[PDB]
Design a protein around this ligand. Structure first.
Ligand code: K
Ligand code: K
Ligand code: K
Ligand code: K
Ligand code: K
Ligand code: K
Ligand code: K
Ligand code: K
Ligand code: K
Ligand code: K
Ligand code: K
Ligand code: MG
Ligand code: MG
Ligand code: MG
Ligand code: MG
Ligand code: MG
Ligand code: MG
Ligand code: MG
Ligand code: MG
Ligand code: MG
Ligand code: MG
Ligand code: MG
Ligand code: MG
Ligand code: MG
Ligand code: MG
Ligand code: MG
Ligand code: MG
Ligand code: MG
Ligand code: MG
Ligand code: MG
Ligand code: MG
Ligand code: MG
Ligand code: MG
Ligand code: MG
Ligand code: MG
Ligand code: MG
Ligand code: MG
Ligand code: MG
Ligand code: MG
Ligand code: MG
Ligand code: MG
Ligand code: MG
Ligand code: MG
Ligand code: MG
Ligand code: MG
Ligand code: MG
Ligand code: MG
Ligand code: MG
Ligand code: MG
Ligand code: MG
Ligand code: MG
Ligand code: MG
Ligand code: MG
Ligand code: ZN
Ligand code: ZN
Lengths: 63, 50, 109, 251, 77, 91, 15
RNA sequence: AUCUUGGUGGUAGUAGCAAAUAUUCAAAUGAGAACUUUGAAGACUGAAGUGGGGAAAGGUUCCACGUCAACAGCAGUUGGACGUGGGUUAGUCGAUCCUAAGAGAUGGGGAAGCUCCGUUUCAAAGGCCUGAUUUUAUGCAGGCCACCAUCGAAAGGGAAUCCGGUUAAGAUUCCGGAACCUGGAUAUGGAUUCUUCACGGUAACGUAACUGAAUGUGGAGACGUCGGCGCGAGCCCUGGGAGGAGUUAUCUUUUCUUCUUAACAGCUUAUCACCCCGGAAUUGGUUUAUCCGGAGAUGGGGUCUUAUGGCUGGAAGAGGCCAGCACCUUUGCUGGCUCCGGUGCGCUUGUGACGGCCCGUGAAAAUCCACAGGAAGGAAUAGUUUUCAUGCCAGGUCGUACUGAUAACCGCAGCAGGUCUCCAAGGUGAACAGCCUCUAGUUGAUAGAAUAAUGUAGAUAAGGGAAGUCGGCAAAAUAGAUCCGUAACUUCGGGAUAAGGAUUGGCUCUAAGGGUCGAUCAACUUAGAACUGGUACGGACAAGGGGAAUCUGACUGUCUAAUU
């Protein structure tokens, strides 16, 4: 029952937090997810000819 | 002491056999003056020092 | 949930006393002693792992047939392919240049 | 009094050298026919760190002249020697960095290292990182080269004594500050039990000539005779002078 | 220990000199569909190794049980 | 963003040890961790591995060198001296 | 292959 | 004679038997029960345990039967006690073998001498191979190499085993099944040969095999530490289904629980690495981490290690869970089901490819293999080959019970001390914190009655606020997280959580952030809004007081075990 209510977003406000933001969820773990999303999408587009290798290379460095 | 030398185990076997009270019939012997076993040992009282 | 014991008298976490937990046909977890992992044979020239050779602890190499321990070439299970290629090139070229060295010396005479 | 720290060292118990991780003694090849009369070629197979030592070592492999086998030597690497390089050792070897020549066979001004004191001693002088000997003269009648050592001492040696051309590698080691006690700790862990060091004035009289007193102080001259006996030689032994050296130390 | 596929190979094993016992186990299994069928495993004991032939078709099974030698001491189940 | 005005690699030492010692360590720390140009294969892949030992990642050739840089000034002047004397004896 | 194994083969052929 | 040994008083039925939360009811047993046993209840350890195993150490304490004089600072019918017996099963687990720091004979040299040095030396320092000869298992035939005893690890190195069952007490040791290693013996198949010692593949390399002495060269054995990332395993969590149990005034398609698969073997499975084709600037590929490429990138196509996973054999016949008949039966007997999934910055652990660090670069030897070499031997109607398969025989010796500590060890003892290590569930939470719980274990520790003073341990306090005191000693106050805001000084790194403020619950919502082929599947993080309450809300637990200066030691580090 408690786990369900947490799924819906309860019990999670400032007065229920005791670890830091990073201790709760490391900012590195958030970056690695993000950059792995962007790298995946770029590879997909390039491989389907939605983008060329020249736009790919520039976007990869901007990601 | 689970993994023990034979020499240690042989000494322990000797100690097992000696750990007994005096046989009662000794007391009946003619001119007997042995009352009890005066060299009895116990693991809680005195250590063997190997 | 269920906790396990070492199966031997060594109680310490040494390199030779590693366990994995395994579930048995009796439905219970149990430690299983693991042997140390084998390293791949390495080339005598460059140091790289040799392709085609089995990876085993040393004495296990005695139990297995010769095809597991070699490859079909000069220096088979000893030097890698690119190391053998350099040996052949170098042997051929230096032995030729030796013929030229002598002739150039024999002309100047 | 009790036996002082500097006297305990000779018994060599806890004060022996920590040699577990060393590669073997660095030494030239044994001086044999080939080296006396011609040269022999070896290959540099490896260049490798030796625990305790600044300079890296070079594992040089030579063929045996009399038996079908190889013979690994352990040289102290000169600056510039590389894996795969051939090294030439003997009377007739050419004047290139890494080669082993008799000192008779090199011009004045040659830089050498790992020089033998006596011929066939297998190496003695200029072996620490960044050091070398300079040849400064020949006496072909007496068969004696003259050389300048790292200390700045001049010295006359047999012209048959061998050296390696060039300077020992790993130079400039002692320019980086150690910074931390811990770095000195790890340095001396691979050498011997010489560190850290308690000052004699921080001890009691029983333990050191300097010990004791209601202030820490030496109390007699710190300069000690050369003829003093064990237990007295603490401080500055046989000092010609003392105090800050105002100038250059070179001859 | 060892599964043997070829029936020609299996029959060689039954006639081998060290082979004194065999076993015939019947499993009730289910295929890709929920239709059930009687798998049979023939197992011959050997010396170093037990060898099993798995026969799913109960026709071929019935033939195979007949063609075992009468020297071989066969345990049904 | 530029993260330190000056300490650079020596920012790992915090405020300890003295500016003058940190500054001397910094010069040699930069040299010892630099990539150097390989004399053999031409690539910029020579890195220190223990004082005096400089190895190329690409071609795998190791060279004996200085404690904190591949070539000390003393060893350069020696190479040049030895070349000079070698040419004097060879005519 | 080890000497003990080589020696075994040599005995086997000597019969 | 603070005499010696022995005995005995007063003190005195006195000090006392108060740490570790905790006991209660009934029955049984028995002369006797606060304390034994069973049952019922109430609690605790709370997986960095009061649980399950071991190392050192002990030595029978293990288990049973009998049993209470002494011992268990109360008791005792109970016991680690007393008496009498029973009990430890190995080719595969250890020892045994190897070498480490080291220890230590010999040759020699010292020393009046007990002995000392030294460990390969200033020594005539051995012991293998092969054929035979068929005289015999030694001289003979040949060859071959010569380093320097030995001891030193129950955590280092190291040939080989697993599952289920079984006892009062033993089990990786017994039984049943199923494997494997070493040494020996050895003949059948397969393979090989008239091109004598195999073929295929451009290649990386493949294969059931596929001659190879001396000698030599390589490899494995064989190695730090930290960091993030990937992958595996076990655990955790969770869906559907098939069973059993619990709750049911009401509600709950509910809560709990069973649904497993060993070593070994076959086939298959990879990051890395490598090969072929090809020839790159409009530089491309690419990691969380920026490295790679004309010394050949990307790309296309292949090869390899088998860590690891999958499928099959092992193996359902075992184990587990149920049901239905037997019945103070040996204790049965019969039948059924034992299935299919999901998820992840999870935990623990293994491992891969990497990166950081060093004036630190992180054992040795036995042992095993490969290669180079070409000694030697070998066919035609018959020769070779046991590194391929199958088959035969053997595997000695010593250890093995149990505790491993608030009662099995050391501390005069059944002592709140000390003493090395493995496994490790749910919730809350950053968390192996504290608090609560499941599995397992315990419920021990003299008790009853009463509730004075003085204590010990724990608390609270009007108004004042350090006036107390050598001295704020002791206590209080502060405390988590989010946002804001942070001075002097400074070695420019710091100071800094400076100082100083605000917020925090519950409920109902909203938004953003993904995977796989427009469909479909799935985590938790963050931000916002409404409503709501005795304005509470890090609600217990957990958890900095701060500032202005001075003396002094630069810093981390270290010492007077038991007054610094
Ligand atoms: K192979
Ligand atoms: K020291
Ligand atoms: K000092
Ligand atoms: K003094
Ligand atoms: K044994
Ligand atoms: K051992
Ligand atoms: K080791
Ligand atoms: K590393
Ligand atoms: K004692
Ligand atoms: K005051
Ligand atoms: K300090
Ligand atoms: Mg975290
Ligand atoms: Mg970051
Ligand atoms: Mg005694
Ligand atoms: Mg293979
Ligand atoms: Mg000093
Ligand atoms: Mg003092
Ligand atoms: Mg004195
Ligand atoms: Mg003083
Ligand atoms: Mg004096
Ligand atoms: Mg009293
Ligand atoms: Mg008391
Ligand atoms: Mg009680
Ligand atoms: Mg508690
Ligand atoms: Mg509790
Ligand atoms: Mg008992
Ligand atoms: Mg009593
Ligand atoms: Mg009593
Ligand atoms: Mg007894
Ligand atoms: Mg073993
Ligand atoms: Mg001696
Ligand atoms: Mg030994
Ligand atoms: Mg071991
Ligand atoms: Mg037992
Ligand atoms: Mg058995
Ligand atoms: Mg751990
Ligand atoms: Mg046991
Ligand atoms: Mg036990
Ligand atoms: Mg325990
Ligand atoms: Mg005791
Ligand atoms: Mg105690
Ligand atoms: Mg949580
Ligand atoms: Mg109590
Ligand atoms: Mg008050
Ligand atoms: Mg008040
Ligand atoms: Mg006030
Ligand atoms: Mg006052
Ligand atoms: Mg006053
Ligand atoms: Mg205080
Ligand atoms: Mg301040
Ligand atoms: Mg603040
Ligand atoms: Mg200080
Ligand atoms: Mg003290
Ligand atoms: Zn190679
Ligand atoms: Zn290079």
């Amino acid at each position: 029952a408690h786990a369900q209510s947490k799924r819906e977003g309860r019990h999670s406000g400032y007065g229920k937090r005791k670890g830091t933001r990073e201790a709760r969820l490391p900012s590195q773990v958030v970056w690695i997810r993000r950059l792995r999303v962007l790298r995946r999408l770029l590879a997909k587009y390039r491989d389907a000819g939605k983008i060329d290798k020249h736009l790919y290379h520039v976007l990869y460095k901007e990601s | 002491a689970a993994q023990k030398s034979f020499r240690i185990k042989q000494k322990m076997a000797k100690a097992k056999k000696q750990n007994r009270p005096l046989p009662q019939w000794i007391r009946l012997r003619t001119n007997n003056t042995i009352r009890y076993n005066a060299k009895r040992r116990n693991w809680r009282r005195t250590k063997m020092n190997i | 949930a269920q906790r396990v014991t070492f199966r031997r008298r060594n109680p310490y976490n040494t390199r030779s006393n590693k366990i994995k937990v395994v579930k048995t046909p009796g439905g219970i977890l149990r430690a299983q002693h693991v042997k140390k992992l084998a390293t791949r044979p390495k080339c005598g020239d460059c140091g790289s792992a040799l392709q085609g050779i089995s990876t085993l602890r040393p004495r296990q190499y005695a139990t297995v047939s010769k095809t597991h321990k070699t490859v079909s070439r000069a220096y088979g299970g000893s030097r890698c392919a690119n190391c053998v290629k350099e040996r052949i090139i170098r042997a051929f070229l230096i032995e030729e240049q030796k013929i030229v060295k002598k002739v150039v010396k024999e002309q100047t005479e | 009094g009790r036996v002082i720290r500097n006297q305990r060292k000779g018994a060599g118990s806890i004060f022996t050298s920590h040699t577990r991780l060393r590669q073997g003694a660095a030494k030239l090849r044994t001086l044999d026919y080939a080296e006396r009369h011609g040269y022999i070629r070896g290959i540099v197979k490896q260049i490798v760190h030796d625990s305790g030592r600044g300079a890296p070592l070079a594992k040089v492999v030579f063929r045996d002249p009399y038996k079908y086998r190889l013979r690994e030597e352990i040289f102290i690497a000169n600056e510039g020697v590389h894996t795969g390089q051939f090294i030439y050792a003997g009377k007739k070897a050419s004047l290139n960095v890494g080669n082993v020549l008799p000192l008779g066979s090199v011009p004045e001004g040659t830089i050498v290292s790992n020089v033998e004191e006596k011929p066939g001693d297998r190496g003695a002088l200029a072996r620490a990182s960044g050091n070398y000997v300079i040849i400064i003269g020949h006496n072909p009648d007496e068969n004696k080269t003259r050389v300048r050592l790292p200390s700045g001492a001049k010295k006359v040696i047999s012209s048959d004594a061998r050296g390696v051309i060039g300077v020992i590698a790993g130079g400039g080691r002692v320019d980086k500050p150690l910074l931390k006690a811990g770095r000195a700790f790890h340095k001396y862990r691979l050498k011997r039990n010489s560190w850290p060091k308690t000052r004699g004035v921080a001890m009691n009289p029983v333990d050191h000539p300097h010990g004791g007193g209601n202030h820490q102080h030496i109390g007699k001259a710190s300069t000690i005779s050369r003829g003093a006996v064990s237990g007295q030689k603490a401080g500055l032994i046989a000092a010609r002078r003392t105090g800050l050296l105002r100038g250059s130390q070179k001859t | 220990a060892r599964e043997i596929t070829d029936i020609k190979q299996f029959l060689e094993l039954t006639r081998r000199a060290d082979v004194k016992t065999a076993t015939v186990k019947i499993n009730k299994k289910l295929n890709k569909a929920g239709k059930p069928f009687r798998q049979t495993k023939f197992k011959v004991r050997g010396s170093s190794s037990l060898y099993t032939l798995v026969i799913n078709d109960a026709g071929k099974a019935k033939k195979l049980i007949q063609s075992l030698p009468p020297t071989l001491k066969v345990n049904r189940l | 963003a530029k993260r330190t005005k000056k300490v650079g690699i020596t920012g790992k030492y915090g405020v300890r040890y003295g500016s003058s010692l940190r500054r001397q360590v910094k010069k040699l720390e930069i040299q010892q961790h630099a990539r150097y140009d390989c004399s053999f294969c031409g690539k910029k892949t020579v890195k220190r591995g223990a004082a005096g030992i400089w190895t190329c990642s690409c071609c795998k050739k190791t060279v004996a060198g200085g404690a904190y840089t591949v070539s000390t000034a003393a060893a350069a002047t020696v190479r040049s001296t030895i070349r000079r004397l070698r040419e004097m004896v060879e005519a | 292959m080890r000497a003990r194994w080589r020696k075994k083969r040599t005995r086997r052929l000597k019969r």
